[PDB]
Symmetry: C4
Subunit: 164 residues, 4 copies
Amino acid sequence: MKEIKLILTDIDGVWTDGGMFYDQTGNEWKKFNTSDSAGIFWAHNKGIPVGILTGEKTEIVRRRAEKLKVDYLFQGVVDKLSAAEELCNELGINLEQVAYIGDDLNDAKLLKRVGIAGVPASAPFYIRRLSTIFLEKRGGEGVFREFVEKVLGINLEDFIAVIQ
Amino acid sequence: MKEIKLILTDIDGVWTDGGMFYDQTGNEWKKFNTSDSAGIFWAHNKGIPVGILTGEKTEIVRRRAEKLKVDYLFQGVVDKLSAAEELCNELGINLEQVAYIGDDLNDAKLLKRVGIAGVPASAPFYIRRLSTIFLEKRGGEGVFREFVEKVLGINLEDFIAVIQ
Amino acid sequence: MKEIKLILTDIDGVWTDGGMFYDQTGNEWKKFNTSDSAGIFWAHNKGIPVGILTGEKTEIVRRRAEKLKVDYLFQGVVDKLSAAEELCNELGINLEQVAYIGDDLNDAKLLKRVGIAGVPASAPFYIRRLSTIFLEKRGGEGVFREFVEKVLGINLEDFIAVIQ
Amino acid sequence: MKEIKLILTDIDGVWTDGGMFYDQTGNEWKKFNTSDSAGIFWAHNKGIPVGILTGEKTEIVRRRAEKLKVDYLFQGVVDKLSAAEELCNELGINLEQVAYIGDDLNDAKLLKRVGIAGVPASAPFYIRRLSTIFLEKRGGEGVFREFVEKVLGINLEDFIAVIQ
Ligand SMILES: [Cl-]
Ligand SMILES: [Cl-]
Ligand SMILES: [Cl-]
Ligand SMILES: [Cl-]
Ligand SMILES: [Cl-]
Ligand SMILES: [Mg+2]
Ligand SMILES: [Mg+2]
Ligand SMILES: [Mg+2]
Ligand SMILES: [Mg+2]
């Protein structure tokens, strides 16, 4: 896999199965999968930061990002490509050096520009054919972890080294 | 596909898997799928309004409808066919120009009268027989999106046009 | 099908997938499926009462039973066979005239004594082999509805008559 | 099977599908499966204590451990192997007399040292290959029950004895 300086990810439909839980009082939930915490683990193990880009804006996601020590969080993003370009500029890198995973229409422009594009198996067909690697997992099933492990070429030897 | 002037939809079992979450305090939840927001996107892209018909009446659904900018919301509806007919009268269209998706007994009368009837794959067989197009997805899996994309003939060219 | 005068049902693992949601504050949730409301519909259409027997005791279930107009509710039940006997004795009913659906160890004694025993496809093997009819559905997927429809012989003629 | 004196288990990804539900207010949920309560039942029927080891630390899990009468609860565990070793010392047993089920990186060292290692079908490949018995079930689907029933050789005769 090519040199990656930054891993970027959408939330809904990647870190979740797209589920948005509403109650009667104005509260909202998302269901994350702890498996995806290993995606952050491996990225940080390899010295690579992770950022979240989302068009939603919730305290749900601020708290999850905090729990997992995610390096960057941008919410209420209207243009994910622009947001990614701004973060690349912030860090002194280019989009070819970015791996991005997303699942829907508002991810497409960014997916087409990054060094490595990932799309979960659960995403719409139009979006899946933008993926530059095959991801078997669906949103919420640990597909962010799957993406990171493929992008970084994590193998049995890496595993053996971290469980010493 | 027939000329459609209005898309109507049930909620529970279409926008959800039928799940109704109850706690100990009288609160209630539903789990929506963000994928279904694209059904509204495509309808509005084609200049078609969307209405929700539901026999339930919840702040859950009021809030979800307003998040997605749904054009019409009728809750506490005991007679979905008559609600659809009244909206058709208001809009100056007929039921043959309506696409409706529903999943259960109280949807049947309306399903039999519309121009295009959709039923999720998870619905009872005697309701599925009423569908006039095949839907692969189950309730809560993005079947409202699936329905809209089929009804409106959304294709790769439409996709390419919206992503710049 | 043999004469059934009462339908009895467990909750967890039948009306749900066994899920028990806990938060940080002492609240609890269950996820019901609206499909199962049709089981009450068909029972009542045929003049048959429904009772719930559960070893748990929650406001969750009290509220669900009330909305669905369930005829009898017994919570905190230590011995489901005894509870069924005592209800049936009040009503004049023999266990051979009862259909009961349950999923786990504390259901077995009653399942072995009723006229029609149902067990969801998701239940443990030792319990499934007690079922006297095959149920395809899993807990929380509408298996109470499936059971009722099979028990009462609900057919296309019934459907046609209710949706005219 | 091997003689087992202690059953140990992780929570997230074993007793759950890995789901971690976050709301807007700082609360958190897990979804347990009631089927897993039979794992405690069978362990206690055979006179074997059960302990939980988890790196998380929540009121959610305090409550579940209480409901199920779990013998030992260790949360915020930094090193699961060390925690198991210390508990074994207290009990005067060795790791070869322990059955442990876990699903992820921080379970690997302990899985490699116990007498019977179990890993759910949903776990990462690198962890599944450490399992010494095959488990069909995924996290949250009753895999703790499956593990206990296999480890203790529960059979139809055992079932018949408990439902008298
Ligand atoms: Cl978004
Ligand atoms: Cl859920
Ligand atoms: Cl309804
Ligand atoms: Cl019970
Ligand atoms: Cl852990
Ligand atoms: Mg998304
Ligand atoms: Mg419905
Ligand atoms: Mg049960
Ligand atoms: Mg775990």
